[PDB]
């Protein structure tokens, strides 16, 4: 893992409450290979490494209970093969009028180069 210069490897994303991308920073393309528009409406489960799906399901449940929390380290499968390690600070955004959740805002920081 590489923990220096993480600002240059950080990208923002926005999600529905059912784990779909509704927005992604163009910075993801240089880091992981995806174009933001191809992520839209797609599930995080299409990209989590198989070893991490479980923990990330629990982590999402933790997020929904706490309102904000860090994800724990996990791996995203990269567009052209292999994966990168990353970690996410998640924040649920609520409608103040009825306190229903509207979306999840994420600050994602990539912790490695693409690995096999």
């Amino acid at each position: 893992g590489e923990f220096k210069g993480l600002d240059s490897k950080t990208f923002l994303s926005e999600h529905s409450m059912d784990m779909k991308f509704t927005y992604c920073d163009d910075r993801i393309t240089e880091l992981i290979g995806y174009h933001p528009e191809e992520l839209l409406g797609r599930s995080a489960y299409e990209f989590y490494h198989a070893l991490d799906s479980e923990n990330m399901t629990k982590s999402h449940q933790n997020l929904c209970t706490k309102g904000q929390v860090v994800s724990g380290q996990y791996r995203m499968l990269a567009k052209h093969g292999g994966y990168v390690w990353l970690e996410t600070q998640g924040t649920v955004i609520y409608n103040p009028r009825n306190l229903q959740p509207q979306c999840i805002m994420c600050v994602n920081y990539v912790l490695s180069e693409i690995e096999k």
Binding site: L12, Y23, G67, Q68, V70, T91, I93, Y94, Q102, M105
Partner: protein, 111 residues
């Protein structure tokens, strides 16, 4: 029907340092017209102190969310109601100054 909204990043002084291109549909500006400007420069006079106070409070909240509803001057010079939900982020591995992440949605002022 999905809300119309866009993400922005600000320094703690309120200056836009990143703007998601959904801003065009939301408030009419290209991202390059917002970058480098303070959010308060688009704020209705009656809401300017409110917005300053909101940005001050969000820094004190050290990552927790604050939300504010205020009037934002669109590219067509019309006052749009915006609800901004904001929080700070700081890279946990360094001591970089924190910045502010906002999600900005056009909402109704109606009962």
């Amino acid at each position: 029907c999905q809300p119309t909204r866009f993400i922005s990043r600000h320094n703690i002084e309120g200056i836009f340092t990143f703007v998601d291109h959904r801003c065009v549909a939301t408030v009419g500006y290209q991202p390059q017209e917002l970058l480098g400007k303070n959010i308060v420069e688009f704020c209705h006079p009656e809401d300017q102190q409110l917005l300053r106070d909101s940005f001050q409070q969000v820094v004190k909240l050290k990552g927790q969310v604050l939300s504010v509803m205020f009037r934002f001057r669109s590219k067509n010079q019309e006052w749009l109601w915006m609800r901004t939900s904001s929080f700070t982020f700081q890279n946990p591995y360094s001591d970089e100054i924190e910045y502010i992440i906002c999600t900005n949605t056009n909402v109704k002022n109606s009962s």
